[PDB]
Design a protein around this ligand. Sequence first.
Ligand SMILES: Cc1cc2nc3c(=O)[nH]c(=O)nc-3n(C[C@H](O)[C@H](O)[C@H](O)COP(=O)(O)O)c2cc1C
Ligand SMILES: Cc1cc2nc3c(=O)[nH]c(=O)nc-3n(C[C@H](O)[C@H](O)[C@H](O)COP(=O)(O)O)c2cc1C
Lengths: 358, 358
Amino acid sequence: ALFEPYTLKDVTLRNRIAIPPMSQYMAEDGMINDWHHVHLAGLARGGAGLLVVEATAVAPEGRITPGCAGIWSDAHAQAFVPVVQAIKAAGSVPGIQIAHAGRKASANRPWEGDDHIAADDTRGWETIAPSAIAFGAHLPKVPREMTLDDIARVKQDFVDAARRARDAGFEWIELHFAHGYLGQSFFSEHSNKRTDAYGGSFDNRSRFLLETLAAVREVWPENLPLTARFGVLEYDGRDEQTLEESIELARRFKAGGLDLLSVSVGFTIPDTNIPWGPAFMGPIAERVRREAKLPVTSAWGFGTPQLAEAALQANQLDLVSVGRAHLADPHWAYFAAKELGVEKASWTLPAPYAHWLE
Amino acid sequence: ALFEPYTLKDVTLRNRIAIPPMSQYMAEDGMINDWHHVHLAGLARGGAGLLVVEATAVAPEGRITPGCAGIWSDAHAQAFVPVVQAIKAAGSVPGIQIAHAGRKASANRPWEGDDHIAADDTRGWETIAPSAIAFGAHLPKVPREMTLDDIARVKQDFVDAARRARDAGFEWIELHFAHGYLGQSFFSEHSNKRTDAYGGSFDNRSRFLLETLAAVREVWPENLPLTARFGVLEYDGRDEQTLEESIELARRFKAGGLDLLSVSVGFTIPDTNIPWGPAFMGPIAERVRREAKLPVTSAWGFGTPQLAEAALQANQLDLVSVGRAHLADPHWAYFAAKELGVEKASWTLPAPYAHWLE
Ligand SMILES: Cc1cc2nc3c(=O)[nH]c(=O)nc-3n(C[C@H](O)[C@H](O)[C@H](O)COP(=O)(O)O)c2cc1C
Ligand SMILES: Cc1cc2nc3c(=O)[nH]c(=O)nc-3n(C[C@H](O)[C@H](O)[C@H](O)COP(=O)(O)O)c2cc1C
């Protein structure tokens, strides 16, 4: 099942393996470089059906860190062009996740402190959010409360991002409404205390996300999968209530043209109890898939080929996302093909490798 | 031991893992391209101390196949420049093996027939050799017997190759006197029936190889390791006699400035009985190292980390060459570091990987 093709709109994946977006923190002023080119091209040659490029910021202040990729100008977009072309040459589908880190922005690289940049550090910048409330813990900076014009500008930033991604050749797009960044923070009552049209009720908290989806839909081709990542629960003790609302929004996403939902956890606040474990997201992903009638993917511990296979056969997922295993071994898909007994498994890789490994 | 550094002349390897030259058959008219760039850059990031670029032909007719890399012009050399730079950025030592396929030239890619190109095929070309004798089997073409001027031209080709490799930034060079190609074929009485100064006696059969070494030594920097690959036996039933002569030449190589010998089998003729097995070359490599008092490396089945480690501790080898395992997993060195219990093994890889795998 893991090695069956998958067709969504006009795009066909050679198998059900997806490489989720994985920030590399190697960009400079949003510009990617040979780090990203070799990293992504190598992964694509590895065998995976779909390769989703890391969170790429729609605006400079939307970066998580000073090393995050960006696409907030045509020059930033043009940098992706050769990389998209190499992904394609390798037979993998190029996707990109476009993002805005909201209140979690302006942080150090994970191996350089992983915390909010000091106030006197010339690399830092003011963060924006639905409300002037800090995440807390290692991210103590209070964001600036967004104005209506801020909301209009960020929405237009996402549209400009999607248009650039389209013109750079990406065949799959993913809106980053998860992991406690801007979009997610608009939906959660934890982070959104607004009293205008973008806060309060379910409809108001959904507005930013729905409006961003719709605006992007106007520039993104109808024949290329339009997707989003969304934290459907927080493990904050409000799980049944949050899940119900998240699934309702899923339905609205579907109605608004979303082709697939990447299902995750919110990470909106630090005060939570997440039951980490191999494929722990499976049951939750399955429920979203069932109740909103929407294809889904998820991640976390599916680097065990049998687990990925089990999730597919149980129809908990339509694609299995495999992250860290690909950082460890860019040729993981070949390893999975061996594990699962695929005929001529070495031909998961290109000929200059496959010939000698068969 | 596998993860101890190694210093040879002015060059220091971060560990004892070497990636042997592995032809990719993806070049066009000798020119390398993004296949090679991503392949080599990815391998370098994998952790290995030394990365030796595939057999690179000193002359067009010296290619094995129409897909082999070449360095017979300054434009060919300039193509290597960015790739050398990425290898270095990754902290691996860039080396290159320069070569001439002799009578085994003009062949199909291994996955496209692996045999001599048909006579009416516009891709093929006349092969040259010490004598007009075909390899046989799947390589039936009779080569043209080289003239003295042919020998002068090929020697100068190797010199021009070494100079280009130097100027492109390579820090390690390897002359390909193994595997039944030109150099090897000059040494073996099987392939060399000449009656001039380049055939007959031990001194005459050694002349081409020694003269090529000396000529290259004039352009190659004295502070960068100068090495060769040499088939020391054939398993043709003349093993003790061939090994003695090969070891004598090893001594002469050492006396002539060779810093390390990559020890292999001859593959000069097809009528042989090679005792393939995990690390089967170990004992033979050890003897060459001992009797010629020369550092050595070898390959074949050392993809088992414990085997590589054993060979080093037994002092059978100074570097362990690991080939196919790196085609399977470009991050093999990280896998070995885990297997062997290295402290902070994930930091065998660059930070954007290591941070998440620790
Ligand atoms: C290096 C790294 C960077 C990541 N960056 C992002 C990101 O840019 N966008 C995102 O939505 N998730 C990101 N993630 C989460 C992964 O997409 C994935 O959900 C997570 O690694 C769990 O899957 P795994 O167990 O296979 O690693 C990142 C994960 C890692 C390890
Ligand atoms: C894909 C491939 C291409 C190779 N090309 C060369 C070559 O260009 N020059 C050379 O001397 N040996 C070449 N070899 C031999 C390898 O350098 C090495 O000796 C062999 O793979 C045995 O080591 P291993 O068991 O780790 O794979 C090649 C091997 C492979 C698999």
